[PDB]
Design a protein around this ligand. Sequence first.
Ligand code: NI
Length: 118
Amino acid sequence: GSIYTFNELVVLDYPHKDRALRYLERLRDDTGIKKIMDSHRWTVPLLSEMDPTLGLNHNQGAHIELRLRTDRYDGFRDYKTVKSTLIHELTHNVHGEHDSSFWELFRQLTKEADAADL
Ligand code: NI
């Protein structure tokens, strides 16, 4: 497999953490996410669940965090929304500020990752 992936997944110590882990695995394995990480040559050492401000990118892709939960028991955010937050965080591998260049790349990555054939 490709080196352009998330090398380690981490979830928090909340009820149904096995479900949070499956959520991160789904994002890592998402064909659209893989396409853009391959196209843009991104390796992210760590992808974590953010404590339940919907995502973070630390040090240009050393570590990305995503808020998966809507509460502290079994409420989770919808996949489409979290996937798009992940694309936002990946865009911060290149652009620090939410400027025109950021949003241009965000739109291009979004289109790639949403392609109908994947
Ligand atoms: Ni941002």
